[PDB]
Design a binder for this molecule. Structure first.
Ligand SMILES: *[C@@H]1O[C@H](CO)[C@@H](O[C@@H]2O[C@H](CO)[C@@H](O[C@@H]3O[C@H](CO[C@H]4O[C@H](CO)[C@@H](O)[C@H](O)[C@@H]4O)[C@@H](O)[C@H](O[C@H]4O[C@H](CO)[C@@H](O)[C@H](O)[C@@H]4O)[C@@H]3O)[C@H](O)[C@H]2NC(C)=O)[C@H](O)[C@H]1NC(C)=O
Ligand SMILES: *[C@@H]1O[C@H](CO)[C@@H](O[C@@H]2O[C@H](CO)[C@@H](O[C@@H]3O[C@H](CO[C@H]4O[C@H](CO)[C@@H](O)[C@H](O)[C@@H]4O)[C@@H](O)[C@H](O[C@H]4O[C@H](CO)[C@@H](O)[C@H](O)[C@@H]4O)[C@@H]3O)[C@H](O)[C@H]2NC(C)=O)[C@H](O)[C@H]1NC(C)=O
Lengths: 49, 97, 317, 53, 53, 53
């Protein structure tokens, strides 16, 4: 019975990050462009793009 | 195949090198929430708890009962067994008495 | 309950996820949050992972009738009583500790939790789950009868010993809050309150300060400075609705309780059929109340198997 | 509730019996129990005979 | 869903009161899938509601 | 209102026909129509794992 483990998402509001391409059995990763988080107390990353 | 039996295949109980091909695919989060959305087909082994049929003992041919743990087919009724024996001369009774 | 089993929760604190339906049909930031549930027994004993730690007081001691949660980066407590789950009918809770609840619920197609708040405000979290276990045996019954036989099906334990599987926990990332800024007259005033607060002010000054005390700039407006509480000490579960702190490795570990056990169950028996013989056949008369299952096969070289769920008074040959 | 009618209830005390299902899934010797219920009526009416005075 | 309406509340003297009428309640779903709770990932589709003013 | 999306079905291309393999969990629609001068429309509420051509 399979079990798709998913970690916490990583986010950084100054620049960019990149992929890793490891060898986990069905590894699937992708980095997305300019987002805008909205955590509990207002906005999170303190910029807009 | 992603959805029919055996989409997660390992060579033995303690090993490595799984064969996950469940068609995993990621999308992008909607507007203003921190979440990771994805989409995949459900488990084949959870389809194979209810899509499996009856056991064989409901329709086995010669009225034989099929047990399971050291897999058996016990108490059939087919064919015939030949024998051959050799009893000693002390087991008989002589024609005198 | 051995009180030494909760020493793994000594540096742990609950969190606030994004349970996107709260009964009223709109999103929340609730304490309770159905992360994932999993069902791998056979008597239908599900196991639910929720965010609000139960059975532990604010200090970190095993008190039974207490549930600690979080509300605006501040610990609170609430009562273990008036906590229940229900899919489509109210169902019992059989043993629970930490993040984990072990229920017994009837079939439905949803699942919610709720507990009474310290200000008496019932807050909840529901999520679509299709619960329908296969009932043991060959009838379709609903209650236990007082007379029957024994049919096996597994279940979980009720022990809380640490057993070989775990979930990871890390340093919590950040809490941004616009409460900590204030603009009196040409001056932002970052109140501290007792927590290290980070800013990113870009008027003409420095944009890094881990100021554990109050600090003013006397040059910025409130639409230029942004507060964020940092450098915590208590770990929390690496949820998929809470962002990762940094791209380093694991840091903590807590065992998931209740390992597996086989068991049995009582199943009703159907009453004996009425037969009628007479020429190379038999005419059977059936009296079911809940739908049973008739089947037969031949004994020769070619069986002719047959099956049917019988519901009311019929007859077959 | 006629005070002359309840006067049979003098030497009668309620008991505890073997209930099959308490309502959670397991058995218990409960004070409340159903012995037998009847609808010799012809609509949805019952005369539940509880084991509790 | 369910095909009867019942509204009720406690009285000031702590007695449940209610009234119940025969009405067929089974709301048709908006979209092309019969879903129960709202998912955390999907599409927006126009519909009507009642404003809370 | 917010509404869930069904998963992408696994198709299989064959000679002048198309094998689709559907995986619903809550019931969805399935329509199609030809693009010529004679559509022959189809509709069905798919509920379980089925396979169509
Ligand atoms: C306190 O808060 C302020 C406000 O956000 C932060 O300051 C910003 O920091 C980021 C750091 O990445 C700055 O962004 C960088 O700007 C550089 C120069 O800016 C010109 O170009 C960008 C776009 O290239 C325009 O937006 C801008 O108007 C200027 O014309 C760029 O060279 C950088 O490019 C990087 O990203 C691009 C993708 O766009 C890549 O292709 C490049 O290779 C490179 O990696 C980047 O855009 C930003 O300008 C700063 N100011 C503002 C007002 O936002 C502070 O960082 C924060 N304090 C701390 C400690 O974090
Ligand atoms: C509910 O009840 C069922 C009843 O069967 C229990 O099922 C048994 O579970 C145990 C768990 O340990 C199984 O034991 C393990 O079986 C593995 C595979 O079985 C093969 O090998 C065994 C023994 O050689 C044969 O009997 C069997 O036919 C297969 O050929 C083994 O690989 C394991 O071996 C490990 O331990 C031995 C020492 O005993 C070492 O020498 C090995 O190197 C290895 O480390 C182990 O023996 C058992 O097979 C199951 N019974 C079956 C399948 O009939 C459930 O466990 C129980 N539920 C719960 C929750 O306990």
């Amino acid at each position: 019975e399979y079990k798709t483990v998913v970690p916490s998402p990583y986010i950084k509001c100054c620049g960019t990050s990149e992929c890793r391409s490891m060898e986990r059995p069905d590894y699937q990763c992708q980095v997305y462009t300019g987002v805008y988080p909205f955590m509990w107390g207002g906005a999170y990353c303190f910029c807009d793009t | 195949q992603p959805g029919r039996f055996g989409d997660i295949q390992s060579r033995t109980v303690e090993s490595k090198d799984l064969y996950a091909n469940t068609a995993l695919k990621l999308s992008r989060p909607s507007s203003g929430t921190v979440h990771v959305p994805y989409t995949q087909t459900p488990s084949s082994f959870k389809y194979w708890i209810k899509e499996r049929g009856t056991s064989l003992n409901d329709k086995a041919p010669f009225g034989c009962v099929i047990k399971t743990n050291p897999v058996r087919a016990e108490n059939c009724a087919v064919g015939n067994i030949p024998v051959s024996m050799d009893i000693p001369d002390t087991a008989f009774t002589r024609v005198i008495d | 309950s051995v009180t030494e089993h909760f020493n793994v929760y000594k540096a742990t604190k609950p969190y606030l996820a994004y349970c996107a339906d709260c009964g009223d049909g709109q999103f929340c930031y609730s304490p309770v949050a159905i992360e994932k549930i999993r069902d791998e027994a056979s008597d239908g004993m599900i196991k639910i992972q929720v965010a609000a730690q139960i059975g532990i007081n604010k200090g970190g001691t095993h008190e039974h009738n207490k549930i600690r949660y979080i509300a605006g980066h501040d610990m609170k407590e609430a009562n273990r009583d008036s906590l229940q789950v229900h899919t489509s009918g109210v169902c019992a809770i059989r043993g629970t500790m930490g993040h984990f609840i072990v229920a017994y619920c009837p079939p439905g197609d949803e699942l919610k939790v709720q507990f009474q708040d310290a200000e008496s405000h019932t807050q909840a979290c529901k999520v679509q789950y299709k619960h329908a276990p296969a009932p043991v045996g060959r009838e379709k019954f609903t209650v236990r009868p007082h007379f029957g036989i024994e049919v096996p099906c597994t279940t979980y334990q009720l022990t809380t010993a640490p057993t070989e599987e775990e979930i990871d926990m890390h340093t919590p990332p950040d809490i941004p809050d616009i409460t900590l800024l204030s603009q009196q007259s040409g001056n932002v005033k970052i109140t501290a309150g007792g927590k290290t607060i980070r800013y990113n002010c870009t008027c003409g000054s420095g944009n890094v300060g881990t100021t554990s005390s109050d600090k003013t700039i006397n040059s910025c407006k409130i639409a230029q400075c942004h507060a964020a509480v940092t450098n915590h000490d208590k770990w929390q579960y690496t949820s998929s609705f809470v962002p990762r702190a940094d791209q380093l490795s694991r840091k903590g570990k807590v065992h998931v309780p209740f390992p597996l056990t086989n068991s049995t169950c009582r199943v009703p028996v159907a009453r004996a059929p009425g037969v009628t013989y007479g020429k190379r056949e038999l005419t059977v008369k059936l009296h079911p109340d809940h739908p049973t299952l008739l089947t037969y096969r031949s004994l020769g070289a070619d069986p002719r198997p047959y099956e049917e769920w019988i519901d009311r008074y019929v007859e077959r040959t």
